[PDB]
Amino acid sequence: MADQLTEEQIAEFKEAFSLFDKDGDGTITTKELGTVMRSLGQNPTEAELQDMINEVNGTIDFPEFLTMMARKMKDTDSEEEIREAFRVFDKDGNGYISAAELRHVMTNLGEKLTDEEVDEMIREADIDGQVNYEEFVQMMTA
Amino acid sequence: VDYNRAKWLKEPNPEAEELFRMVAEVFIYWSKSHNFKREEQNFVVQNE
Secondary structure, three states: OOOOOOOOHHHHHHHHHHHOOOOOOOOOOOOOOOOHHHHOOOOHHHHHHHHHHHOOOOOOOHHHHHHHHHHOOOOOOOOOHHHHHHHHHHOOOOOOEEEEEHHHHHOOOOOOOOOHHHHHHHHHOOOOOOOOOOHHHHHHOO | OOOHHHHHHHHOOHHHHHHHHHHHHHHHHHOOOHHHHHHHHHHHHHHH
């Protein structure tokens, strides 16, 4: 929840949690632990509930609860992390970025870090120079 | 050349000498030119 969550979604977490309200401890026990997000809209399975109960006297409060959605923040992180890249670059959408386009995507912006690119190509080098942007990013966005 | 190579070896040929001189400049230009490297790479990958 280190400022990565947005105000609107934090507010709707709270409004769902306030649907049961009761001074931040009542009617929000482990029986409603799934019901609150079932009413919110996405469905918790057995894995989701065990993630809720992994680190959790026995009755949750709002800090603990939104701490749980911090580790649930790990979910739905597949398409929106590359949505920005697909919008900004890759007009053709082939994923095989051209030579100049690849100079440009590693044109260092402010950080001016070094040895990381040459490290990446000494660790792995494509063949057909012709570096793939997809293969290029999944390695970090694992 | 691979078919008729033995014949020129047995009988030296000024035409073969001219061909060797010819491909000498081809090879040296091939080595010298840098953009030609990626250009041939692109041409080959486009032809498949």
